[PDB]
Amino acid sequence: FVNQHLCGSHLVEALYLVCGERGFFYTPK
Amino acid sequence: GIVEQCCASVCSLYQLENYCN
Ligand SMILES: [Cu+2]
């Protein structure tokens, strides 16, 4: 895999892809 | 944190796995 530049909704897309049915927490500042 | 890191800098998909349930 390669490094990612991910802002806004694009980060939550990547989280969804990586975590799938496991689910995930989106926790900004 | 990572929301910041991925956007201001870069992050890997492996770093993202840390946020899975
Ligand atoms: Cu966009």
Numbering used by the authors:
A (entry chain B): 1 to 29
B (entry chain A): 1 to 21
In the authors' words:
Primary damage, i.e. photoreduction, was followed directly by XANES as a function of radiation dose, while secondary damage in the form of structural changes around the Cu atoms after exposure to different radiation doses was studied by crystallography using a laboratory diffractometer. Hexameric copper insulin is found to adopt the T6 conformation in all of the crystal structures reported here. At higher doses no significant changes in the coordination of the Cu I site are observed, whereas the Cu II site is seen to change with increasing radiation dose. Compared with the evolution of the electron density in the in-house crystal structures, the structural changes around copper in site II seem to be detectable at radiation doses of around 0.1 MGy and above. At 100 K, disruption of the water structure in Cu site II was detected at doses above 0.1 MGy. Thereby, the radiation damage to the water coordination could be initiated by the photoreduction of Cu2+ to Cu+. In our structures no significant difference in the first water shell around the Cu I site was observed in the four different structures. In the second water shell, the water molecule next to the coordinating water apparently moves away from the Cu site with increasing radiation dose.
Hexameric insulin binds two metal ions by the coordination of three histidine residues (HisB10) to each of the two metal ions. In its natural form the metal is zinc, but insulin is also known to have affinity towards other transition metals, including Mn, Fe, Co, Ni, Cu and Cd, all in the +2 oxidation state. In the T6 conformation of insulin studied here, both of the metal sites are exposed to the solvent. The coordination sphere for each metal site is thus completed by water molecules, some of which are weakly coordinated and easily exchanged.
